[PDB]
Amino acid sequence: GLVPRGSHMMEILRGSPALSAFRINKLLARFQAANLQVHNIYAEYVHFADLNAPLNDSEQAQLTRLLQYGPALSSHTPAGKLLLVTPRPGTISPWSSKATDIAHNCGLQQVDRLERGVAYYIEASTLTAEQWRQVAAELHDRMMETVFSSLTDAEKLFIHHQPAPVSSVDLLGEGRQALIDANLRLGLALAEDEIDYLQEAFTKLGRNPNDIELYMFAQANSEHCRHKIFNADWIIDGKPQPKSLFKMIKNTFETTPDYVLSAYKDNAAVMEGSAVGRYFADHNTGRYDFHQEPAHILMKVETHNHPTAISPWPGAATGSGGEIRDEGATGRGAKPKAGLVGFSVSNLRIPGFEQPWEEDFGKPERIVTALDIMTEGPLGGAAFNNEFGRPALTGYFRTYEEKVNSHNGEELRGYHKPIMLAGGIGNIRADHVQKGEIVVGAKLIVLGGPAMNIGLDFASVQRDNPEMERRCQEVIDRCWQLGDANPILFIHDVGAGGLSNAMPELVSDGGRGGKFELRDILSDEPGMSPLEIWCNESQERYVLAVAADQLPLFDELCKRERAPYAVIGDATEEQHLSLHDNHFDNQPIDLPLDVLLGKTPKMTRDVQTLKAKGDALNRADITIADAVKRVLHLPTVAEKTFLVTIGDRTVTGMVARDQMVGPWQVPVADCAVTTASLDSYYGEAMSIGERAPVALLDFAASARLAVGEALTNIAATQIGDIKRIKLSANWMAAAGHPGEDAGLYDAVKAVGEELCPQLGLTIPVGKDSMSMKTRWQEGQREMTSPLSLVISAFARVEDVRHTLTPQLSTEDNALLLIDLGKGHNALGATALAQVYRQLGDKPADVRDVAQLKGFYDAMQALVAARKLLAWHDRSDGGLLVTLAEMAFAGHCGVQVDIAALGDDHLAALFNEELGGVIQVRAEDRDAVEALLAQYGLADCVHYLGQALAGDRFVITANDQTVFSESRTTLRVWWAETTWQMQRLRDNPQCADQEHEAKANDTDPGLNVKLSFDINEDIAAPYIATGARPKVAVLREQGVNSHVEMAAAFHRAGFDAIDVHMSDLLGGRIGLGNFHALVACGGFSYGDVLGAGEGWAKSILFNHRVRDEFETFFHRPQTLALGVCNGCQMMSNLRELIPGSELWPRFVRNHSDRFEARFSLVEVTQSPSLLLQGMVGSQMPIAVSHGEGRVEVRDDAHLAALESKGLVALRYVDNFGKVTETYPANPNGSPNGITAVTTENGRVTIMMPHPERVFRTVANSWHPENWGEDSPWMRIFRNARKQLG
Ligand SMILES: Nc1ncnc2c1ncn2[C@@H]1O[C@H](COP(=O)(O)OP(=O)(O)O)[C@@H](O)[C@H]1O
Ligand SMILES: [Mg+2]
Ligand SMILES: [Mg+2]
Ligand SMILES: [Mg+2]
């Protein structure tokens, strides 16, 4: 199709079927349930190409080919009613941004913009007008899409509007009322004294303020940006208080400044790391090399609570996206490493899986449900982390919604407005920690995405394009990788308020002013007013300052990465802010910074204390047996697989300890651990402590417990000095709600002025979200969150190899409980209470500070001395859950006695006091108990019993059996929540298969079989000569796992060279100079138009580069490796590779979900030179992909491929048999195929990541006797030897 579209032409290209069978049956079932007589539904992707010039026959064929991708699903002739779903007019999908990028990189400049929709064909010849609109409703997201009746209506998506002029607010001609009107019209939310400020400011200037100036001011002065509460003076119960909340947090730094390099003066904090080999490509040579130097650690944690309540996916995605920008913009440039995620929502009320404690209290129509948030939110956060390229290694997920008698009496307390938390750590160079000085005349730049009207219901719908941020990170990396020559003088993230906040922030921080040109800013929507361009909160943008003479270098760096950037201003000596508009020949902004950034009076909060009395727990319906079952069914306690495997946990190749633990990969790791470099055992650790419900009874206790839990979760890691542990404190509260204000102050004081200073813990970073409540009319109703402090702990690790997990051993052992509760056994605000719809009387709390410090120190002593077999702290679910989860991870039984824990067995098993259980060798029990005694924990330590081979979970009290059950049964109950979530979000068959496998106790877990000596470095003789063959580490825009690949080849004796597609196109690199090449993993073009397709087709359509690749593959002795995205790319290049005619395609996983797994595979017989000597071996490997499913044209193709003997790797279950059952086989590949080679064996492509686990320490689970090298190191060594 091709028709006029304004000054352009719009082509309509038919796409492939968009919905698989189960997705269609889910739609049909959804229709039936709603009384909509739908007989059948079919869907097809439809593409729209807005062209600024004609395409010749060749160009047309190329575009049509670019738009041919995805699973080869059953195609049908359209029938029924057409309902086209597309992005809403005035919006541009991220798909469009990346798809259009691909077209341009294939030399199709005529393509102004590509967009995609979904054509639904509905057969239901008996529906009415309202019914059809209800059908329409079920087929699209009302907050992001719209429905059209004709394909031609897509033209509305490309309308170009003329630029809207600035608008002045008539203060001089109307008086104060002009500002009052504007405050309402523009939704400025200005306070009365802020209007007063503005009125005087502009009356003094003698001119009307432009809407843009008022908007910029409003955003910078919102509670979100100014933090008025955290800086206000306080009067509590009549007594003025000396410190503000922020000053009390800073008190922790004043008391403990140890190891802190940067705090409260950047978008993240920085603490000392370790001197290790920072690995990266040299600017001059392009070769990857180790640079022995300090790799310091940055940390930051943020939230996106409001956005997520409106549009979960984007809300969570940009929650991570924004925090990642904070990290990279630290100092003069830094690199994100790992991340963490947090969620707090109300009851899920899963259809058909309702729990006894859940009650529908209703909710506002304008927000989404808790279930929707936990369905779309995690996928959005994972989408950004996966596509950008940072592993998500730790987090929390709590559900809470109950009518309780708290501080303000009987009310509904919960999370209709959720907590969406995203944070992480990164590494930074010593010389880049401090911001540089901004020289007068410095060029002011916007690095990143174009401006769109996203900042401002619909105003809270965000947009994420992780690939754009990835391109930006590559630039930042080039900059800091230049060390002393780093062009970045100052960098800052673009967040709330958009450029209107970020740019003034930047020049102000540097003590300068700035003059800007509105028309220099990159924009993708011409109709925007100056206010919209300047104030929108579009994503993936950074602002920085570079010296004029460094512009050429900076330009070089951006062009090579294809990272958009624009110089939009100049720093000035005069501290004034000017924004000119060349199009309207005027000045939207003309203000002195002292006026714009001037502050209205400081806030004073005069409040009083409200303290709930608490009520004894009613045990009428409670029994220990029923409590176990209920508690294991509380999402907060239950298995979190649905939140873990959806996120990459291996990218960077520096992940030592991820959430999944042991042979059975059970997600119960208490903290995350990464190595500091690809050549060290030093590292970093992240943990989270949180206990919001307790705040409904005791504010201070809830805060102390959050700190305490972060500590107990990280305790079994080798850190040493407790002062190495640094905290991020994120405070969520419903400020203004009765009692919450005084509670917040008491809570901050409890940790900032008392607990942390005494323990020696610094809180160098943090944030606050102060409107955690939701109101609406149910026929007024209110859902108010408990004060919610989330503590994230970060620390330098001394030896990542000594970390302990909950995986119990069955060798002669002793289980010892460390009860920091000192026998209090509090049950108030516990999972137990919650599961019985109660809050209880008294909650847990830090009972003895000295003993908590002693606990930590003792654990550190035990960890360093290698005296522990396992560790698991107590938190949600109490001792019962701790022991249960340990049995789950150890796939064994437990025989414990609790007679010494009090006569109240319910309280003993379910209290959530601090502490945990350590497992030690039986012969070390006395020595360990003696060590603990030396730290003053004698009467807190209790011998419980031992772990035993088997399936029995037994708890006794003298001759009495308190509770006894099949560990497997408990394990399955504990898994029902993730099972149900996976069943409603992914392919039901897959969800069922994974859940059901958990019920088979005979599962031996991951296990190895080796056909060769893993420690024999067959490449050593070659490396010893000093001759190092080069290997082209190929990458394209969006690709995120190249450093780790280079490191693997590097250890094998190769000189790894960074080869960007831009280098090949530019003639800077030629494949004729290489004998080996490797296509890397990552998300080239964000997998848009099919994973690996844009990369491959950009090569195919650029004949010069195409010829280069073909030539390489046709040489007699060249070797090529394609991993993950590289595997997909090469599979789409078959026409250039000899002996590849039988290769399959790689498409969307059968589960229809991204799979981050540690999968078991077997090396099969094939000509592959890279798998030489490894045939018959069985070992786990890193898997991280959403489109790794081998797809053939027909069985004839599959049979031919098999008979030719080209299959090199197959997924096998733990029993060792080839399998297609999920998740043993994570993507559903036929015959378990996941790697194939060519007839001559010189080229091999595989979906798993061998390079991510070549270091034994980077294997989630591995045999205890392994050395530094895992079996996968042999692939790289084989490559080296093969070249000779
Ligand atoms: N939202 C989440 N995203 C990623 N991982 C999570 C999330 N929530 C929990 N996890 C992980 O699941 C495992 C168990 O979670 P949880 O029981 O809440 O931890 P704990 O009680 O030890 O503090 C941990 O390894 C944790 O890091
Ligand atoms: Mg838990
Ligand atoms: Mg824990
Ligand atoms: Mg926790």
Tab-separated table of N, CA and C in Angstrom, residues 1170-1266:
chain	number	residue	atom	x	y	z
A	1170	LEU	N	35.539	-25.542	17.566
A	1170	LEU	CA	35.543	-24.911	18.885
A	1170	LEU	C	35.092	-25.815	20.039
A	1171	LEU	N	34.370	-26.894	19.736
A	1171	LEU	CA	33.921	-27.812	20.784
A	1171	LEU	C	34.768	-29.078	20.799
A	1172	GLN	N	35.931	-29.012	20.166
A	1172	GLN	CA	36.837	-30.157	20.089
A	1172	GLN	C	37.208	-30.701	21.471
A	1173	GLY	N	37.161	-32.026	21.606
A	1173	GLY	CA	37.493	-32.677	22.862
A	1173	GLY	C	36.444	-32.578	23.960
A	1174	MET	N	35.417	-31.769	23.726
A	1174	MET	CA	34.352	-31.557	24.704
A	1174	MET	C	33.118	-32.436	24.491
A	1175	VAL	N	33.079	-33.180	23.389
A	1175	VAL	CA	31.915	-34.011	23.100
A	1175	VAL	C	31.567	-35.011	24.197
A	1176	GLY	N	30.299	-35.015	24.592
A	1176	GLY	CA	29.854	-35.925	25.628
A	1176	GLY	C	29.782	-35.242	26.977
A	1177	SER	N	30.394	-34.066	27.084
A	1177	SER	CA	30.374	-33.312	28.339
A	1177	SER	C	28.972	-32.769	28.624
A	1178	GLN	N	28.641	-32.668	29.910
A	1178	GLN	CA	27.352	-32.160	30.376
A	1178	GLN	C	27.656	-31.156	31.496
A	1179	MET	N	27.291	-29.894	31.289
A	1179	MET	CA	27.542	-28.846	32.284
A	1179	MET	C	26.547	-27.697	32.120
A	1180	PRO	N	26.338	-26.900	33.184
A	1180	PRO	CA	25.404	-25.770	33.120
A	1180	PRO	C	26.046	-24.608	32.368
A	1181	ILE	N	25.222	-23.770	31.745
A	1181	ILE	CA	25.724	-22.614	31.006
A	1181	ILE	C	24.755	-21.445	31.142
A	1182	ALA	N	25.269	-20.223	31.017
A	1182	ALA	CA	24.427	-19.039	31.140
A	1182	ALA	C	23.511	-18.869	29.940
A	1183	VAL	N	22.233	-18.675	30.245
A	1183	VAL	CA	21.191	-18.468	29.246
A	1183	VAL	C	20.505	-17.138	29.568
A	1184	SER	N	20.384	-16.270	28.567
A	1184	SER	CA	19.733	-14.973	28.725
A	1184	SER	C	19.206	-14.531	27.370
A	1185	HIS	N	17.973	-14.911	27.061
A	1185	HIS	CA	17.389	-14.527	25.785
A	1185	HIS	C	15.880	-14.703	25.729
A	1186	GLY	N	15.253	-13.927	24.851
A	1186	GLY	CA	13.815	-14.007	24.675
A	1186	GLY	C	13.454	-14.603	23.327
A	1187	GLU	N	14.434	-14.678	22.431
A	1187	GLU	CA	14.210	-15.227	21.096
A	1187	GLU	C	15.273	-16.261	20.723
A	1188	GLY	N	15.376	-17.324	21.519
A	1188	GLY	CA	16.369	-18.349	21.238
A	1188	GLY	C	15.806	-19.663	20.727
A	1189	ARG	N	14.503	-19.697	20.464
A	1189	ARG	CA	13.858	-20.914	19.990
A	1189	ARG	C	14.218	-21.283	18.560
A	1190	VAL	N	14.858	-22.433	18.406
A	1190	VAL	CA	15.230	-22.919	17.086
A	1190	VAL	C	13.934	-23.156	16.318
A	1191	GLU	N	13.844	-22.590	15.120
A	1191	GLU	CA	12.659	-22.751	14.292
A	1191	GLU	C	13.078	-23.189	12.897
A	1192	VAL	N	12.490	-24.286	12.430
A	1192	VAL	CA	12.780	-24.823	11.104
A	1192	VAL	C	11.574	-24.599	10.198
A	1193	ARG	N	11.785	-24.719	8.894
A	1193	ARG	CA	10.702	-24.509	7.938
A	1193	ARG	C	9.685	-25.655	8.008
A	1194	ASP	N	10.178	-26.869	8.254
A	1194	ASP	CA	9.332	-28.064	8.358
A	1194	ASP	C	10.170	-29.218	8.924
A	1195	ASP	N	9.562	-30.373	9.194
A	1195	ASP	CA	10.346	-31.481	9.742
A	1195	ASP	C	11.433	-31.917	8.761
A	1196	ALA	N	11.183	-31.761	7.462
A	1196	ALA	CA	12.176	-32.136	6.453
A	1196	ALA	C	13.472	-31.364	6.704
A	1197	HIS	N	13.321	-30.094	7.065
A	1197	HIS	CA	14.450	-29.215	7.366
A	1197	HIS	C	15.125	-29.668	8.668
A	1198	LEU	N	14.316	-29.993	9.672
A	1198	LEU	CA	14.862	-30.439	10.946
A	1198	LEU	C	15.626	-31.751	10.755
A	1199	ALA	N	15.009	-32.698	10.055
A	1199	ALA	CA	15.633	-33.993	9.814
A	1199	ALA	C	16.948	-33.860	9.046
A	1200	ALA	N	16.955	-33.000	8.034
A	1200	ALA	CA	18.147	-32.780	7.225
A	1200	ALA	C	19.261	-32.219	8.103
A	1201	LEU	N	18.933	-31.198	8.888
A	1201	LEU	CA	19.904	-30.580	9.789
A	1201	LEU	C	20.499	-31.616	10.733
A	1202	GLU	N	19.640	-32.459	11.294
A	1202	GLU	CA	20.090	-33.488	12.223
A	1202	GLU	C	20.967	-34.534	11.539
A	1203	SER	N	20.512	-35.019	10.388
A	1203	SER	CA	21.242	-36.029	9.628
A	1203	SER	C	22.597	-35.537	9.130
A	1204	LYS	N	22.707	-34.236	8.877
A	1204	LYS	CA	23.965	-33.665	8.416
A	1204	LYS	C	24.961	-33.638	9.577
A	1205	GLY	N	24.439	-33.800	10.792
A	1205	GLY	CA	25.266	-33.820	11.990
A	1205	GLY	C	25.829	-32.482	12.437
A	1206	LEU	N	25.066	-31.412	12.233
A	1206	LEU	CA	25.518	-30.068	12.582
A	1206	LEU	C	25.111	-29.563	13.968
A	1207	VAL	N	24.300	-30.329	14.691
A	1207	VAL	CA	23.896	-29.914	16.039
A	1207	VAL	C	25.081	-30.129	16.980
A	1208	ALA	N	25.468	-29.076	17.695
A	1208	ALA	CA	26.624	-29.127	18.585
A	1208	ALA	C	26.313	-29.051	20.076
A	1209	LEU	N	25.156	-28.498	20.428
A	1209	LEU	CA	24.756	-28.385	21.830
A	1209	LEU	C	23.260	-28.635	21.966
A	1210	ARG	N	22.871	-29.335	23.030
A	1210	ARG	CA	21.462	-29.631	23.299
A	1210	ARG	C	21.141	-29.445	24.776
A	1211	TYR	N	19.947	-28.943	25.067
A	1211	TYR	CA	19.522	-28.794	26.454
A	1211	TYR	C	19.137	-30.189	26.919
A	1212	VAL	N	19.501	-30.529	28.149
A	1212	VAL	CA	19.152	-31.826	28.714
A	1212	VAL	C	18.567	-31.538	30.090
A	1213	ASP	N	17.701	-32.413	30.593
A	1213	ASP	CA	17.179	-32.169	31.926
A	1213	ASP	C	18.220	-32.684	32.905
A	1214	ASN	N	17.960	-32.531	34.195
A	1214	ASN	CA	18.927	-32.973	35.184
A	1214	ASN	C	19.142	-34.475	35.202
A	1215	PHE	N	18.219	-35.216	34.601
A	1215	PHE	CA	18.342	-36.665	34.523
A	1215	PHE	C	19.289	-36.989	33.374
A	1216	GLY	N	19.655	-35.952	32.629
A	1216	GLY	CA	20.579	-36.123	31.524
A	1216	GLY	C	20.004	-36.468	30.163
A	1217	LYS	N	18.694	-36.354	29.979
A	1217	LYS	CA	18.145	-36.671	28.667
A	1217	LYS	C	17.756	-35.430	27.869
A	1218	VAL	N	17.940	-35.507	26.554
A	1218	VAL	CA	17.599	-34.398	25.675
A	1218	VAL	C	16.152	-34.041	25.962
A	1219	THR	N	15.856	-32.752	26.055
A	1219	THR	CA	14.500	-32.383	26.404
A	1219	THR	C	13.953	-31.125	25.759
A	1220	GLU	N	12.631	-31.063	25.712
A	1220	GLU	CA	11.922	-29.913	25.182
A	1220	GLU	C	11.004	-29.400	26.295
A	1221	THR	N	11.087	-30.036	27.462
A	1221	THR	CA	10.279	-29.612	28.604
A	1221	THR	C	10.916	-28.380	29.244
A	1222	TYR	N	10.061	-27.465	29.681
A	1222	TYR	CA	10.453	-26.188	30.276
A	1222	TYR	C	10.557	-26.278	31.800
A	1223	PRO	N	11.528	-25.571	32.405
A	1223	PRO	CA	12.528	-24.705	31.769
A	1223	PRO	C	13.872	-25.390	31.473
A	1224	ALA	N	13.962	-26.700	31.716
A	1224	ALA	CA	15.200	-27.444	31.444
A	1224	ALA	C	15.701	-26.973	30.082
A	1225	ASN	N	14.766	-26.917	29.139
A	1225	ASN	CA	14.991	-26.392	27.795
A	1225	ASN	C	14.212	-25.084	27.980
A	1226	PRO	N	14.918	-23.958	28.157
A	1226	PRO	CA	14.269	-22.661	28.369
A	1226	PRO	C	13.477	-22.004	27.244
A	1227	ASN	N	13.742	-22.374	25.995
A	1227	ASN	CA	13.046	-21.731	24.886
A	1227	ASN	C	12.150	-22.600	24.007
A	1228	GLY	N	12.165	-23.913	24.228
A	1228	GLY	CA	11.319	-24.800	23.446
A	1228	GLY	C	11.911	-25.288	22.137
A	1229	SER	N	13.229	-25.188	22.003
A	1229	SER	CA	13.900	-25.636	20.786
A	1229	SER	C	13.736	-27.134	20.558
A	1230	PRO	N	13.346	-27.526	19.332
A	1230	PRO	CA	13.163	-28.941	18.991
A	1230	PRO	C	14.457	-29.711	19.234
A	1231	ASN	N	14.328	-30.928	19.747
A	1231	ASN	CA	15.480	-31.773	20.019
A	1231	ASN	C	16.493	-31.091	20.933
A	1232	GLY	N	16.037	-30.069	21.653
A	1232	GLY	CA	16.898	-29.346	22.577
A	1232	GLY	C	18.039	-28.570	21.939
A	1233	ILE	N	17.993	-28.419	20.621
A	1233	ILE	CA	19.037	-27.712	19.874
A	1233	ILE	C	19.276	-26.262	20.301
A	1234	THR	N	20.533	-25.910	20.542
A	1234	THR	CA	20.838	-24.542	20.926
A	1234	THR	C	22.166	-24.065	20.357
A	1235	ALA	N	22.789	-24.920	19.553
A	1235	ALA	CA	24.042	-24.593	18.896
A	1235	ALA	C	24.198	-25.448	17.643
A	1236	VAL	N	24.654	-24.827	16.563
A	1236	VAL	CA	24.885	-25.548	15.322
A	1236	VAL	C	26.185	-25.045	14.728
A	1237	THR	N	26.769	-25.841	13.849
A	1237	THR	CA	28.017	-25.447	13.219
A	1237	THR	C	27.872	-25.688	11.718
A	1238	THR	N	28.920	-25.405	10.960
A	1238	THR	CA	28.862	-25.598	9.518
A	1238	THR	C	29.502	-26.921	9.133
A	1239	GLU	N	29.348	-27.300	7.871
A	1239	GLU	CA	29.931	-28.539	7.389
A	1239	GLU	C	31.428	-28.655	7.707
A	1240	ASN	N	32.184	-27.571	7.521
A	1240	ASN	CA	33.628	-27.603	7.771
A	1240	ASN	C	34.044	-27.312	9.211
A	1241	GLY	N	33.055	-27.092	10.071
A	1241	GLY	CA	33.322	-26.842	11.474
A	1241	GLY	C	34.026	-25.551	11.850
A	1242	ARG	N	34.293	-24.681	10.880
A	1242	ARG	CA	34.998	-23.434	11.180
A	1242	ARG	C	34.124	-22.301	11.709
A	1243	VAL	N	32.811	-22.477	11.627
A	1243	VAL	CA	31.877	-21.485	12.142
A	1243	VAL	C	30.873	-22.176	13.060
A	1244	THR	N	30.681	-21.628	14.254
A	1244	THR	CA	29.727	-22.194	15.194
A	1244	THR	C	28.912	-21.075	15.830
A	1245	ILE	N	27.608	-21.292	15.955
A	1245	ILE	CA	26.737	-20.303	16.581
A	1245	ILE	C	25.932	-21.004	17.663
A	1246	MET	N	25.753	-20.331	18.797
A	1246	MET	CA	25.013	-20.904	19.919
A	1246	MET	C	24.240	-19.802	20.648
A	1247	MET	N	23.135	-20.151	21.304
A	1247	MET	CA	22.364	-19.132	22.013
A	1247	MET	C	22.895	-18.835	23.426
A	1248	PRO	N	23.344	-19.865	24.167
A	1248	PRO	CA	23.869	-19.630	25.524
A	1248	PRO	C	25.142	-18.780	25.525
A	1249	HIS	N	25.520	-18.281	26.701
A	1249	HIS	CA	26.710	-17.437	26.842
A	1249	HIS	C	27.904	-18.120	27.507
A	1250	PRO	N	28.764	-18.773	26.713
A	1250	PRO	CA	29.946	-19.460	27.254
A	1250	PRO	C	30.886	-18.462	27.926
A	1251	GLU	N	30.990	-17.282	27.322
A	1251	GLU	CA	31.870	-16.233	27.817
A	1251	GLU	C	31.469	-15.667	29.176
A	1252	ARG	N	30.208	-15.837	29.566
A	1252	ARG	CA	29.758	-15.301	30.850
A	1252	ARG	C	30.105	-16.199	32.028
A	1253	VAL	N	30.441	-17.447	31.733
A	1253	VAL	CA	30.761	-18.394	32.779
A	1253	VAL	C	32.078	-19.141	32.578
A	1254	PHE	N	33.059	-18.506	31.939
A	1254	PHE	CA	34.339	-19.178	31.731
A	1254	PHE	C	35.123	-19.196	33.031
A	1255	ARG	N	34.723	-18.333	33.960
A	1255	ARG	CA	35.349	-18.263	35.272
A	1255	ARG	C	34.440	-19.027	36.218
A	1256	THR	N	34.999	-20.026	36.888
A	1256	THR	CA	34.225	-20.821	37.822
A	1256	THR	C	33.463	-19.953	38.825
A	1257	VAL	N	34.084	-18.871	39.280
A	1257	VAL	CA	33.444	-18.008	40.259
A	1257	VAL	C	32.187	-17.319	39.742
A	1258	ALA	N	32.008	-17.314	38.424
A	1258	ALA	CA	30.841	-16.679	37.815
A	1258	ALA	C	29.744	-17.692	37.476
A	1259	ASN	N	29.868	-18.904	38.007
A	1259	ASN	CA	28.860	-19.941	37.790
A	1259	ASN	C	27.931	-19.964	39.006
A	1260	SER	N	26.653	-19.670	38.781
A	1260	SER	CA	25.671	-19.636	39.858
A	1260	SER	C	25.835	-20.814	40.811
A	1261	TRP	N	26.054	-21.992	40.233
A	1261	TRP	CA	26.304	-23.214	40.984
A	1261	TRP	C	27.389	-23.977	40.236
A	1262	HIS	N	28.281	-24.625	40.974
A	1262	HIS	CA	29.330	-25.401	40.334
A	1262	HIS	C	29.950	-26.400	41.295
A	1263	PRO	N	30.522	-27.487	40.757
A	1263	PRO	CA	31.153	-28.501	41.602
A	1263	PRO	C	32.175	-27.809	42.495
A	1264	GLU	N	32.278	-28.277	43.730
A	1264	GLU	CA	33.185	-27.691	44.702
A	1264	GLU	C	34.674	-27.792	44.365
A	1265	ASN	N	35.060	-28.845	43.653
A	1265	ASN	CA	36.466	-29.063	43.333
A	1265	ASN	C	37.017	-28.312	42.122
A	1266	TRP	N	36.173	-27.539	41.448
A	1266	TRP	CA	36.627	-26.791	40.285
A	1266	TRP	C	37.627	-25.699	40.634
